[PDB]
């Protein structure tokens, strides 16, 4: 029934609130001027970056930023793994399939949720403590200065769909249970969970956005634009890995990127 699908939707929503401390609702409070705690410290050039590091050496700026992204990617994988484990039926899957789904899903989810922390002018960092302008990220020396630009461009169009947290929670579940990841051993029970999640998603969108026609369809088209961000991103990272003194890639991220599309 509709009701079983409502109940799945709510269950994913609560576990998303538990798993992810900075929700899209809070990011949007922060960014709009609403909320009544302090405005984020903004980082727009080298000097502001430096002063931001005492409010929020040895190495070059583009590399400091790179390595900061790694720290937050690592924690994001962790949060996403915990959310995955609350998706009904996920932990009954072959463990090797759980790993494959995370390995390919995590980046797609990361860039979906990054869009929550973004506007056309920059991005929240350190959990809403800071705001790092897009210009400044764009201004970094090659190849570092175009690392983020494709995330921003995706974010601006994705953000126009005006999804909320309750929507996003089912969307990210759907992405995680994609039956076409390379090397999956047993596709069937993954497509059966995903079938149920997609039905949950479609109900959710009709209920939550009754005025937004074909939002389900528009949102399916995004699950495959994400694919492109991911492949471009892996390509640019293979380049950095080749051309930069100390790759220094966190070993969680090395597990994820090894033998990846």
């Amino acid at each position: 029934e509709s009701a079983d699908l409502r109940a799945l939707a709510k269950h994913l929503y609560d576990s998303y609130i538990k798993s992810f401390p900075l929700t899209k609702a809070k990011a949007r409070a922060i960014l709009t001027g609403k909320t009544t705690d302090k405005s984020p410290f903004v980082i727009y050039d080298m000097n502001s970056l430096m002063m931001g590091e005492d409010k929020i050496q040895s190495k070059e700026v583009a590399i400091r930023i790179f390595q900061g992204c790694q720290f937050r990617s690592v924690e994001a994988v962790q949060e996403i793994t915990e959310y995955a484990k609350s998706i009904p039926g996920f932990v009954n899957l072959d463990l090797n399939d759980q790993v494959t789904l995370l390995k390919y899903g995590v980046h797609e989810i990361i860039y979906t949720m990054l869009a929550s922390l973004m506007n056309k002018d920059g991005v929240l960092i350190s959990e809403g403590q800071g705001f790092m302008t897009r210009e400044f990220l764009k201004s970094l020396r090659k190849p570092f200065g175009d690392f983020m630009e494709p995330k921003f461009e995706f974010a601006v169009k994705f953000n126009a769909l005006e999804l909320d947290d309750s929507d996003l929670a089912i969307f990210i579940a759907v992405i995680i249970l994609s039956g076409d990841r390379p090397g999956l051993l047993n596709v069937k029970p993954i497509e059966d969970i995903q079938d149920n999640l997609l039905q949950a998603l479609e109900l959710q969108l009709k209920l939550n956005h009754p005025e937004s026609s074909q939002l389900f369809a528009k949102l399916l088209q995004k699950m495959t634009d994400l694919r492109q961000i991911v492949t471009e991103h892996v390509q640019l990272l293979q380049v950095i890995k080749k051309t930069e003194t100390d790759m220094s890639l966190h070993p969680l991220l090395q597990e994820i990127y090894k033998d990846l599309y």
Binding site: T81, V91, L95, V99, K103, E255
Partner: peptide, 11 residues
């Protein structure tokens, strides 16, 4: 092999 991933999965 994916050692970290396996440990975060079973927990």
């Amino acid at each position: 092999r994916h050692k970290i991933l396996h440990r975060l999965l079973q927990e």
